[PDB]
Amino acid sequence: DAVFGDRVRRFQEFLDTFTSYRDSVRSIQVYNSNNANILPHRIIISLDDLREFDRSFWSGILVEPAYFIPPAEKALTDLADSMDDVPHPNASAVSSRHPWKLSFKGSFGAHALSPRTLTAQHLNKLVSVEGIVTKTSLVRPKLIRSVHYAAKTGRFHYRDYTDATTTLTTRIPTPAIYPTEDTEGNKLTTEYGYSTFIDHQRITVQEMPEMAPAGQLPRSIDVILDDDLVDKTKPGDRVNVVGVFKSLGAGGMNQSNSNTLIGFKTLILGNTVYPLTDFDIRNINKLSKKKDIFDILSQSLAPSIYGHDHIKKAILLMLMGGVEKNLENGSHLRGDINILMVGDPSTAKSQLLRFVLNTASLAIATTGGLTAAVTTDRETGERRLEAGAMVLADRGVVCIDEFDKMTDVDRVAIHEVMEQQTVTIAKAGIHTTLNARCSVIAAANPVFGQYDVNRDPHQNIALPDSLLSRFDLLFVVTDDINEIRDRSISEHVLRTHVTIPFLRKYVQYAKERVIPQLTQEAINVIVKNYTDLRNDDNTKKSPITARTLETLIRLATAHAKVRLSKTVNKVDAKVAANLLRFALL
Amino acid sequence: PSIQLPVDYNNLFNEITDFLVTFKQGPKYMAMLQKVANRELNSVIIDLDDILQYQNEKFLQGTQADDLVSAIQQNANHFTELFCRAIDNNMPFPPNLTRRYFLYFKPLSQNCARRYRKKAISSKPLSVRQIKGDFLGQLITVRGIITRVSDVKPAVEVIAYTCDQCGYEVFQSECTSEECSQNQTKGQLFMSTRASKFSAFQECKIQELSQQVPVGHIPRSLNIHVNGT
Amino acid sequence: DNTEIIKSFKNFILEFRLDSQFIYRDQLRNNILVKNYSLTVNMEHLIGYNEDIYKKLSDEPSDIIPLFETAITQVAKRISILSRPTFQLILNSNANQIPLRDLDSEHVSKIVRLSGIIISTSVLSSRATYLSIMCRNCRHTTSITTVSLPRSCLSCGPDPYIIIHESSKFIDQQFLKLQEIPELVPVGEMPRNLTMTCDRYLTNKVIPGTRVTIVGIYSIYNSGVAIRTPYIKILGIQSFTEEEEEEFLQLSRNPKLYEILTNSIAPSIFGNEDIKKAIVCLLMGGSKKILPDGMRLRGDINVLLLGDPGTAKSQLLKFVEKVSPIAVYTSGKGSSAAGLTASVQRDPMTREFYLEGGAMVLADGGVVCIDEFDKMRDEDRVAIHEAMEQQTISIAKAGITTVLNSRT
């Protein structure tokens, strides 16, 4: 109608009143001409700019997408199809015919929702929804425009198609298949090389657990993506998606079909996907030069725990990590550090793990699919692997509670994770290797609840020695009662009846830039201390093996990162040797 | 609705017939058709490098030339029949219902394309994941590993019937021949299986190798159908 | 004729005065300011204002409540115009409720009041309330507000119209399951379960395990030879005498109150004063506290009887069942984790999978008596651990995961 043309010209005015939009289109046009990969025919519209140019048109997209967006799509397509002559001898007949799609940004107003908050009142509106990608459907091409040649008449022909999804407005459906005869009735010569197809995919978005109240099933919604958005996400990704929330089908309105249970199907026509200082740096490096920065950082860690200085120091060293190496033979050296905690269940283990899990930037909570060697199927039957915490925590940290409760299948898989930093997947028809360079911190408890301090965890907990030897540091804590001292810590509990934001920058910057190497200073210290430990036949937490030498190098390198020195020093080995003795006693 | 495209099948078909007649090994394909005419061979393999060689030969001679290879590249579905149509009239009931021979095209070689200063995108060893919807109806070369092959199954192309009332051979329950359409009585049809056109068909699937897989993804698969010889 | 019903409603909203104020006009005006398109009408004011419309509404609400929706919508929009959608009717009443077993084939299409506990709820679904259609044959357009599409065009063949999706309106609906209180159920009987439906603002107020008071319409719908499944259109849900308060306050003022109640617990048994006193502490339970981080301290007091056989330990549990207002008694052998805790099952009435509570979910806000606790399996014990130390039950079955609270 004439109203459709009016809004097409109105959008053309918007594309001209702010040349910052169509000049980027020209940049796309120039780039595409040079590559004779192709940049997408998509631009992002700032709703605030659209708000100040035409309030009704800006509100038109949000409130009435069916009557405003298709006029805007045509105007943008018209601008792109007319800004250049397209002198390509053959590409002008197929490639230049692809329409241009829109994207949106800026203030969404009231249309910023979640799968739970999304209701029937929000239908037929362009809304932004925040959630998680549970799964993705299979990608298939979808016919858009058909091109065919009428050989008998000696001239080509064409036909377009409409779908309930691709058409925001309720246009007449076209279920007809690619035509064989046209109005003239002659058999048509099919032109696949000049027909137009567009890929299509379906995804499911669910409300994030962070805002989910207990006692209700989770809320989910389906989003439709096409063309450039067809393969831009993977399951498990946090996503903010803007699209048209529209219904389809009928709730038994045809014939009688008057059951009270039938409802109308709804989904979102998504068109925009949002997958989810030097002053500090100079302060980070300056603070490293004071002698007590190692201890001060060791006290900001775990403010709710009194004492446990070595454990807090161990957490800092584990975050700093070591340095990996590569060899001319093709071998690689592990650099990361693992920590294990053992003793009475409720005594300060869940408290320490809570702080580390909350503080660390890439901390993953685990308890007894972490092996990442299992598949999940779509609605149509096709299946895809799901990632595991050990794999996801690459270059991160793994937080384990109830480590004693994990199964034997987990133990055999984590053997290669902690030692070779990789997972060798060997399944029926699926074989791959995934990096598992993750630091591990775990807590375990004895069966009886009360730890026998006279014996090692090999008899108090009875985990395999091969599994236990993979932890660089082990700590045993039990609430041995000193009444005046326990009063001091319990007073804060009875009261309930360096800044961390900068510290996380300190940890981030130190590991980001500092890659310490060994020095002759620590070489003698490592050999002498290792030999002395081998000479020491007295009972200890664990026997002395080459892994203890590896731990000393890893710990010394971590201390150098605390000092932010790209070379190790004798003091770093001295600290590591003392700490290992504490862990071995 | 009618539209216009720069494709002209009249020039291409004349070039195809000329290429069949002229391109030497006498002519390479005429000798091949002669062997088929001698009932020695059952299938015909068309070499796109030979077509590209002739196009460059015509290009170097300064004669008329159209990019026939790209036309076959874009619309191989129809050009398969065109080559059959050329052979059905140039080899030394409707014809298509009775043909028992088979035809295929072999891809361009990357050395040949570079030697003729052109890009053979279709013959590039791309993976199945990289095949977009733009490649529908286009002859392309796929590099991968076959993971599943089905056994031989019947694939009827034209179903044959015989009628008692007229004795005509009807191809596709009631006879549609001219005699029975005129007559008030029609002889009921039955399946003449020995006269039906059987095609040898097998189901095959190709899959990406490990090095072709992006980060953390599952290698995708594509369906390959094999027919004829 | 029906205009008087609308006019009487208009007087009952705009002109009804209580406490020297236009309470219904003001509360509807406040709802408009809040933009909540619903009005809570108190039935006790309706009977005091106009008994004649009460007779029609109580007897034949088939046309009255359509008038309720349209009259309130007109009146509220009039208020909105004066100050500067279809308004949902909400009914609050204190009239006597009919027992769930007393519902019969006589209260059909009659507004009734019930009390019970929600045992299962459904997920929200969208239902049409306003539609616009177009004829496919000749593009004739019209608007429609059970409802079925026209069979012939108004300008085309049978069923020529198609739905104009972008110019239609829909509302949300939920399906609920209600059953009577097990304490009111004599032994040898499974409590009767009743299906209920709620829409718009009345949805998602109650979870399974919540005790509620119901005001709604009794009716049936097809889904035996002709056994139609009964169901309720929800109209309003809510969830001591002065002399009784003084009587119990006097009980609090009794000098020997603690010992008198201690003796009162299972008076047939002799001695056992200590175990009596702990069970008394079980009846009251602790007081709830919430941490500044948002966590909740479990207020339940759980006690284990771990002595020799033949010490009236079984009888002690039985007496608690008769004194605790919310009481569930079950054996360790005849129980399962799905039976005790929550479960997910498909409702055959609406052909949808519902989250359904268990024994440990019904006993929420009360006391449960489990016997032969040693004889139940570890998996049942593991589920109890979450309920005991977190007052929650986590369900992960088929392909859905959820967490449900249980203050048991």
Ligand SMILES: Nc1ncnc2c1ncn2[C@@H]1O[C@H](COP(=O)(O)OP(=O)(O)O)[C@@H](O)[C@H]1O
């Ligand atoms: N102090 C008591 N006073 C009165 N009856 C008692 C007392 N102790 C035990 N009984 C009797 O014991 C019986 C209950 O025992 P019960 O707890 O069922 O045994 P079990 O421990 O094997 O379950 C009752 O019949 C009750 O009369």
Ligand SMILES: [Zn+2]
């Ligand atoms: Zn015949």
Ligand SMILES: [Zn+2]
């Ligand atoms: Zn009509």
